[model samples]
Target chain A: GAMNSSNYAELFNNDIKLFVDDTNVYRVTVHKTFEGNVATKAINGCIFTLNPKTGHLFLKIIHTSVWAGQKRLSQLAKWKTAEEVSALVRSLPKEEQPKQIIVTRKAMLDPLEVHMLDFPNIAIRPTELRLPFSAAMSIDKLSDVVMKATEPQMVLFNIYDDWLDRISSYTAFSRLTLLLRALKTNEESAKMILLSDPTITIKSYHLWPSFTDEQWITIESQMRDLILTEYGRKYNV
Target chain B: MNTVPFTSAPIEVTIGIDQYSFNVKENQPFHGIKDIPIGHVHVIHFQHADNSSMRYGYWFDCRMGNFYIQYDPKDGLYKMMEERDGAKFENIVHNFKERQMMVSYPKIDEDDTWYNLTEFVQMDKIRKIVRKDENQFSYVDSSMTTVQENELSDPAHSLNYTVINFKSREAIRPGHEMEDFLDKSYYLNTVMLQGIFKNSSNYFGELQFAFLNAMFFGNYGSSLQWHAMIELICSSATVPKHMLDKLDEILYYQIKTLPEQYSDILLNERVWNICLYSSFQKNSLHNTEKIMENKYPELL
Candidate 1:
């Protein structure tokens, strides 16, 4: 039987939610790693809104490879024409619509084709990052995008929680923490919330089973304090 | 490896059901055979629809990697998809002919020890199963469903391949067999990736392995690594110059440019220069093996 997706949801809602003076600004970071020849493209960590004014964090330390079935050239060819794509985009809810969309240029379609969507406010930018599959480098690129696109108050970063099954020595969580600090300091209205849900203290036992219970507790507390000291200015000060 | 890594020319497989001559592509590497003899009919068949009014069959050899063989009733759709390369498939049937293959498979020698891995449903008659003084485990009928055969008429059948997985068992005396299985599996995967591609240095050998992975099985960070590995292989003169030149031509169509973010970090000359210097470093350690038989020699 397929595991309930709601367990994952429950894990996020119960254990990971954080609050900072009623503000819920969370940033997501992806730790990408490849073992042997298996190529897995997925998110290893995520930061998302849990409730009205709270946020949550998830870290996938255990490495499980999810094989994405074969890639087909036909799928690329089957994609709708520029006009049709633009029309579909136009039909979305305006209130929650994204201001920008980035599409990778490939053999099947030209980047210029997406330019047909004549939205003055929204910019459909095409960039050749030149590095196609190096997640290490791509994360750096993604960092810059997040910094530039970040708005005032609270904002949600990348939301990819489905692909969280890989191990990596390099995690963007620390880098993203630094970014959040920069954002909070740069913008007076910004408030960062680091959650220390009681459930996380219990769940951390299984999440990092290699580490001793005492070690995990120390690490978790240290992380919570660090985030709080920097972002939770009211409590830290 | 099989006597021939793969057939240099396509082999025609006559479908026993309809007597159709299906041509399996040539020169693609055959893989996953441990003890099977060369020219053994190792095939994975797919019964699918090609387009409107056209039904086709697809076969994927492990050795073929990214490439797959497509067979059609009329051959018009197949030619367009393969030769002209402009057609798209509507839907692909994922059902496999397990019975047909089981019957036609060449008989093993009498002394060969083979495991008859058949799935069985738990019944009330068999209350408990115990292996020679190891442990006893109860079978719950409701816990597992009886495995069934693939339906021929079902178009939405998903998987046509088998994957073996090991789970943890809590017992009085746990054995190291599961651990050994995991270790062996990992070892096999590493060696398979580092099979044919070689460079003077182990680092370069690893890079070549990574390159092959990206080239055949793509990833998010493949664009930069793929190009870097390709360049390293071509420049090192490990393979023939003509083949390298041919690959360079193929790369134009095969490789796609990185998105803006990835390009910012990877699509630069500084990184390329650093990697280029490392690629030239030669290591002579572990170079004592000699070709005693007609086995393909590993290039240092």
Candidate 2:
């Protein structure tokens, strides 16, 4: 069933859950990593938080990587460490703290390990947590998920990792378009922070094989045109 | 016979003595309901009489396949001797004899009787339910070679030539199901018409396109797969013609790029492009995946 407009009433209520220390927290860690066609290189240690009830997202794209291809080689872009992520959550006013914290990853390998010795009050883990994006995977689930929202939701889509690799680019494109379309409000307040890595896979190049550098650029231009034509220029690709 | 312009409105379809009505939307696939897996066939959906929320419709399964009616049967409306899972009343009707054996006739509503559709519903009869009122549909010049040769003259061996008007500008062929025009058109369009791959003048792009199409449409029936397999074989004569070598590379790349679960499915099947094509040729890749999962769970 399509997203029912009536269910939109459920999202406005900001329900808060308290931890052992009486701190409210809503934390969702997005485990980011890319599996190379040639292996050896990736992004890890990123946390994304969303207030499912309020549709606010706190995103941190922190990772380590080793790229041996072009101009930039052996790189690790860090935005926040695991401990820092925890600290950020703690620093938030008690009323602002998230009661629920989830650690999510695309693959089963080297699963995002969270050592919670210091913060007995909060524990972060990922297992298809009750996140809107997971629910947004299909149209049926999306309707129910979106119907509960009072305001638009904020999501983080990391492009560098196994996210695009898990599904075909076309599928990813469609899913992204659907999410953007569904979550976008009249003010365009839906915050979708796309954490991307440009120097990733050569295999992704196969999607448009046979094109030279010039042809590839032309193809990309056409793709931008197509996306803009369909989604309009409001999106920053 | 009345041929009324097909609109995105609910229309009545008379099957034998009873008439079933359902809604149709333009540009929407005839069998567009997402929950019910009708494989790759096209079908028109109708509101089930007992439960208006539930939809019912008939689908053409292919020349070698049997045409069947699928509906969500509300309790007290109809009962099947054998219980089947998922959306509504569904069963394959081979001939009138087989159809007669599957259902029972019982009165439920004050004025309506549970018409044992199996008893009187022939493939042609159910087929006509959508076409009963000749005023509801019209025909125009069909471009398909197979349809054109058969003409509007053959009924016993002919396919339905129903036309659907879209944007009030063109008469679309929802009737493509008559001779499985969608499959043929897809193959022709992907391989012969569009150039999807960037650099390959050879059939590499087409082969990839075909496999992708098979995956997207879930058209992993043996017929389409085998046809695609033959398409691969036929393209062996084209340029840069190390067909087998190139195919092996393509498969390798696919496996390399595919996530572990999907890759495992392909690997477990011991498939290349050829196997992928043929496996989906008969039923659909959906069935093929389940078949593989059940038969060879270790591979999956």
Candidate 3:
């Protein structure tokens, strides 16, 4: 049967609860941690969002990862072959699969994403990630459940959302604009910035409006946490 | 460019599907042309013979950002337009809103010219889509259709004014399944403009012919992105499969994670396309659309 909300109910059996917003953007919440140790260890509880437009990931916040200050996101950057999808539709056991399969490699990143990498956090952003075929070779019903369960791609939106919520819009825009000019001016150095992976909330060192030591010193102890994102980086704040 | 391509008579062009002619004159320009600013490329304008609301304007090889480098980009476009147009902010906004501007930029190859990309929005506003049969499309005046194209070197030249000098690294001529070539700046600029324009009236129009021109010719198999992904749009309106699904059987995507050495066998023959559709239906349409609208809003 096609993947409807009901099938999603049976598929995760309430381990994952799927919901679509008014705009039809798909999102899921892990009601309970996975029973399998491997999957459970990776992410015990989390929320996932799919961009209604590209069917790519919009946001993924792993419970532990979020707490750990790492919000990894893989988007669909490229699709080398699409024909196999049709054939794969037939090869799987009639009873076994859902509509979602795999995205091969990275694809073209939209403008915002290309620039988004400049944020101190979110150092790693691929077009999208797909688990390789060999990973599927050992598939039993349980393996399939776990494999399909390991969905990739997520939103880097919350970082901005949080920033917008807490910080002044004028400050955020002014800083980001200047940051882009610097990154783009030194194209070669930008490559290194991308290669050097940083966690989602990386404020200790960053590519943002410079946070002066004077400002840091003068700042109130209570305001210090919020200051991280105020400058750049969103670990807790 | 050393020798300006100008003529006394208005040359012919088919934009969207309307029949019109344009004469690029330096000394004597078109009416209301002075209100529009001039930059790198000449501002080519033509009034719609039928529709008054839809006028056309263009900026070719303008090399937009470099017009004047700015440290602060949050206000870049406004500043650039002001500098280029040399007008009050109010005038700039007023004139900008009047016409549908097609920003055509050509990436010059060392030898000749490669291809060109034109950012056109409000396509439906300019040309009306006339259909026959359930899916057959016809928009240009009478028959013969628009298919009679070089197809190869054509997309690369789709917007070349002298009949839109395309120079390419390797030119053969070509796809279905909507194959395209991916280059960073060339395609990336379109993505940037696509995003920039989406907020403006210049949203990328989902014109079938534009899609036809892109898919009908040019290099294929690999190196595809930008234009094909956009314009092809998502499945809000089921795209006539002819333009994209021609190679649906063979053109497919495979799952790729870490490449393992011993997984050579798996790599040799791997079949993994999602079947979101039911038993009888193939998830072809929406599937392709999903991949097409690869809108990455703001990571920068």
Top candidate when judged by DockQ against the true structure: 1
The docking quality of candidate 1, as DockQ, is: 0.02
Mind giving the per-residue lDDT tens digits that candidate 2 earns over B44-148?
A: 333323344423223332322322332222442111122233222232222322433322212235622112111222234333422433222211111211122
TM-score of each: 0.17, 0.18, 0.18
Q: Model 2 - which docking category?
A: incorrect
Quote the positional error of residue B263 for candidate 1 in Å.
Answer: 25
How many residue pairs clash per model? Answer: 12, 39, 34
lDDT tens string, model 1, A101-187? 333334213321332325545544333433121121123333333344422222233322211233111122322333344334422
Off by over 4 Å in 2: A1-46, A63-81, A105-114, A123-237, B1-300
The local lDDT score (0 to 100) that residue B130 gets in candidate 1 is 8
Q: What's the chain B TM-score of candidate 2?
A: 0.22
DockQ of each candidate, alpha-carbon based: 0.02, 0.01, 0.01
Poorest stretch of ten by lDDT in candidate 2 chain B:
B163-172
Model 1 alpha-carbon drift over 4 Å, by segment? A1-237, B1-159, B163-300
Please give, for residues B87-106, the per-residue lDDT of candidate 1 as tens digits: 22111111122212112223
Which of the two candidates, 1 or 3, achieves a greater TM-score against the reference? 3
Candidate ranking (DockQ, best to worst): 1, 3, 2
